[PDB]
Amino acid sequence: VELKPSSAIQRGPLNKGGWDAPHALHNDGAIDRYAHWRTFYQERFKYTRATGKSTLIFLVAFPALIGYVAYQSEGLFEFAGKRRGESVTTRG
């Protein structure tokens, strides 16, 4: 026996059956490449002295500064209806 698929299977092409509409876009070839690049930048991104600057800024320093601000100013201000001379803070 030669091991081959059964001949009772009748096969044919895939016709999704959409109505092929006219050309309402003129592809440009360079815009598409610019988009492919800006879309798959992640697979070519490399670490260097500017990428590192931006990365450490926006993922170390600014988060740490915002957190220092928060965890100092946690329960500090409370000034609903306050009046002259009264302190707006709950701490020193």
Partner: protein, 469 residues
């Protein structure tokens, strides 16, 4: 019932030609069903976890072992229908999937060795039964001696299983040298604390566990499951793991081992990582069986692990049969046959299967998402119970490794589904041949259980809270 089967089949098969082998398989299939129907009432004896010792003190019968016995039979009535009911009555599928004469005898003898292990209460019965399960499965790998790869497989499995039987017997003889006993019931809190038996019992666990593919000795078993025929791979890959894991779960040997924690972590990492680049199906599913062996190893450390084990072993077995069955059905719709024994090897041969048979792919998705642990499929409710037990007993790093291993294993589990729902040219439009009725109904029934068996979880919990408590 097994014995009268094995005894009768020897005579009845010697009296019978090569042309009756399918009918004889069908007979023993129906016979096992009649056992499982008519003798199943014996679960009443195990009310309130009444436990019985038999043949002296060699065997032990409780609800755990009985359920494992029913499961092994349910596996063995599905694994037999695969040999005794031809899919398509074509010459190709005659040549591809034809049982041999002695195969069924070796299956039942392996069932017997599996059940003597779980039912064992003394190490002597364990050593006799693991040798029975081991020798029967050397021969099952080797019975298809017209293939080169199976010949290589049985030879390696013989040697590397013999080495582990040596390790097991060395451990038993050490336990006897220390304590003058072959019975683990002769242990207790006093004797555990008072004696340095940690080394002497982990050596038992490892000598049993390296026979099921635990890391870093996974490769040899993976080469075997790949190189052997698919309808043998579906049996060898499951039953030995059930038997040995059940024996190690029932006997609360390794309560809080550090070695077992390390190895089980390594299995989850290996079985999740090394199965990503695989292009072959069987190696992919073998690495899947390994990571599931990792998850089930993690409840050897618990001392209350029956429900989580029973639920996971059941859904694992069901999903394992169903996925291999889907792979078997799909052989009709592919373009290239690679072998007389392994018609399908590479995952990229299932391409476009949605355009041929879509409901086969629905079953594949249900089964895949069950492996991953997507609810409301049964795999969720199984991995949930494991997480409950380990977190209730104090393993936290391992739970994170467990989560991570599930995520990593989604990728090699979804490779099948991704290529299956891809598009293909030269689709199927008609075929006057039709697949068998029984195998379709079996596959369907396993699918419907993986899908809807979440409905019965409370009922199962009530029955468990009576018969196991």
């Amino acid at each position: 019932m097994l014995i009268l089967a094995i005894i009768s089949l020897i005579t009845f098969v010697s009296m019978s030609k090569l042309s009756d082998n399918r009918a004889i398989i069908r007979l023993i299939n129906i016979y096992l069903i009649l056992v499982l129907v008519l003798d199943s009432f014996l679960y009443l004896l195990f009310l309130n976890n009444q436990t019985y010792t038999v043949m002296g003190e060699l065997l032990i019968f409780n609800s755990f072992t009985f359920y494992i016995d029913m499961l092994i039979y349910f596996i063995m009535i599905v694994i037999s229908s695969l040999y005794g009911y031809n899919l398509y009555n074509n010459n190709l599928y005659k040549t591809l999937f034809e049982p041999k004469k002695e195969l069924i005898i070796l299956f039942l003898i392996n069932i017997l060795g599996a059940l003597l292990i779980v039912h064992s209460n003394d190490f002597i019965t364990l050593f006799v039964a693991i040798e029975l399960q081991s020798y029967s499965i050397y021969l099952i790998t080797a019975i298809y001696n017209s293939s080169y790869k199976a010949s290589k497989a049985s030879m390696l499995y013989f040697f590397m299983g013999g080495i582990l039987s040596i390790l097991i017997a060395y451990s038993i003889n050490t336990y006897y040298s220390v304590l003058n006993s072959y019975t683990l019931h002769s242990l207790d809190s006093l004797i555990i604390n008072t004696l340095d038996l940690n080394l002497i019992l982990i050596a038992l666990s490892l000598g049993l566990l390296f026979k099921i593919g635990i890391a870093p000795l996974h490769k040899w078993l993976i080469s075997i499951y790949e190189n052997t025929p698919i309808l043998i791979t579906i049996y060898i890959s499951l039953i030995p793991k059930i038997s040995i894991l059940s024996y190690l779960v029932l006997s609360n040997i390794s309560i809080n081992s550090l070695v077992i924690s390390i190895l089980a972590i390594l299995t989850l990492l290996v079985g999740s990582v090394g199965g990503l680049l695989q292009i072959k199906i069987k190696r992919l599913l073998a690495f899947s069986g390994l990571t599931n062996a990792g998850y089930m190893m993690l409840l050897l450390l618990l001392n209350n692990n029956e429900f989580s084990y029973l639920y996971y072993i059941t859904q694992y077995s069901i999903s394992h049969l169903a996925i291999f069955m889907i792979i078997i059905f799909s052989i009709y719709y592919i373009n290239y046959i690679n072998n007389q024994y392994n018609p399908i090897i590479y995952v990229n041969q299932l391409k476009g299967l949605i355009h041929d048979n879509a409901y086969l792919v629905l079953s594949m998705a249900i089964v895949v998402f069950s492996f991953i642990g997507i609810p409301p499929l049964l795999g969720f409710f199984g991995k949930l119970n494991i997480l409950m037990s380990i977190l209730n007993n104090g393993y936290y790093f391992i739970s994170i490794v467990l989560i991570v291993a599930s995520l990593i294993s989604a990728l090699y589990y979804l490779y099948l589904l991704n290529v299956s729902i891809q598009d293909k040219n030269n689709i199927l439009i008609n075929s006057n041949e039709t697949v068998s009725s029984v195998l379709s109904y079996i596959l369907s029934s396993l699918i419907i259980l993986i899908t809807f068996g979440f409905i019965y979880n409370s009922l199962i919990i009530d029955i468990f809270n009576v018969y196991f408590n």
